[PDB]
Design a protein around this ligand. Structure first.
Ligand SMILES: *[C@@H]1O[C@H](CO)[C@@H](O[C@@H]2O[C@H](CO)[C@@H](O)[C@H](O)[C@H]2NC(C)=O)[C@H](O)[C@H]1NC(C)=O
Length: 317
């Protein structure tokens, strides 16, 4: 795995700091923070205020989130700078204590990219709880790329991209901190996810990989948004956050938790917002930036994707 010093940031610190917010606290002084990393086409609040912001609060954490502009549609490598900066800030701001990271969709890819290429945060992240992470990207973005209607981060999240290749070759498909991955075979955004094996996009070696259908059966259906908001997802997430091993425990969930509806502890208002979670994301992607090539890899990642093609040309170290 990459070692040594962290690569330099491309964005100024004041800009990176501006993308971090905590509920009822400044990042410089916060009690038991949990860092939430949003999905493609959303801001932190859009991804989590109908679900894990109120739910993590009820578990004793102070939710904090990053909102890389515009709506996580830009270069995933830059989105990661927001996360690395945030971990550095929240670790110090909480009395030099490790903190958990909880993610949805692209957020999981951002977290794993950060842990792989920025060594300094490895001892600052307590555990990772990723919902519907696309570590190997998704094959469904292929046609959008070919139609030239894909945002920078959509190109990068396409299976076979230079970015996903670099992650794999650097050793990023094995967990770095205790990780739990919750995903669904019926995900309509991230595929392939149907094998319940290392071939799935959400799978990490040595991680606690939980495909919903492996527990609840082939007739259990939860979509991309439901992977984050369902009652089943809540039970697994709570297990991961409370676990002494840093990963969700099988003894903590079962058949009776196979409920696809939004988490029981959410208020009626929060449940309505959670049900329509994907609406703002769909709108942001259609209105957002689009290009006809994958963004170039930063210097620190180039040696791990030699031979791939990005906007500027063929990747060389
Ligand atoms: C979106 O991502 C691009 C590419 O990472 C960022 O552009 C780079 O910014 C740094 C710092 O200004 C420059 O050194 C690079 O030359 C830029 N690269 C390109 C390809 O232009 C850009 O800053 C990001 N935008 C936002 C809003 O985060």
């Amino acid at each position: 795995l990459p070692s040594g010093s962290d690569p330099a940031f491309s964005q100024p610190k004041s800009v990176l700091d501006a993308g971090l917010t905590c509920q009822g606290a400044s990042p410089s002084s916060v009690s038991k923070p949990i860092l939430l990393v949003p999905g493609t086409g959303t801001t932190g609040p859009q991804s989590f205020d109908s679900n894990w912001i109120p739910l993590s609060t009820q578990l004793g954490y102070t939710p904090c989130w990053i909102s890389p502009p515009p709506f996580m549609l830009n270069d995933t490598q830059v989105n990661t700078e927001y996360m690395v900066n945030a971990i550095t800030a929240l670790y110090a701001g909480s009395g030099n204590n490790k903190l958990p990271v909880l993610t949805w969709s692209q957020g999981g890819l951002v977290a794993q990219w950060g842990l792989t290429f920025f060594p300094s945060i490895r001892s600052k992240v307590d555990r990772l709880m990723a919902f519907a992470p696309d570590y190997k990207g998704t094959v469904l973005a292929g046609p959008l790329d070919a139609l030239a209607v894909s945002a920078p981060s959509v190109w990068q999240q396409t299976t076979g991209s230079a970015l996903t290749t670099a992650l794999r070759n650097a050793g990023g498909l094995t967990q770095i901190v205790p990780t739990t991955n919750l995903y669904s075979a019926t995900d309509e955004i991230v595929q392939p996810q149907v094998s319940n094996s290392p071939l799935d996009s959400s799978y990490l070696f040595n991680g606690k990989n939980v495909q919903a259908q492996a527990v609840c059966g082939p007739l259990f259906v939860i979509d991309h948004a439901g992977s984050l908001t369902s009652q089943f997802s809540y039970v697994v997430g709570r297990s991961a956050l409370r676990s002494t091993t840093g990963q969700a425990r099988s003894a903590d969930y079962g058949i009776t938790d196979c409920n696809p509806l939004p988490a029981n502890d959410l208020t009626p208002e929060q449940k309505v917002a959670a049900a329509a979670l994907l609406a703002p994301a769909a709108a942001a992607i259609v209105a957002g930036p689009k290009q006809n090539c994958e963004p170039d890899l930063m210097p620190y990642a180039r040696p791990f994707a030699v031979g791939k093609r990005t906007c500027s040309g063929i990747v060389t170290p």
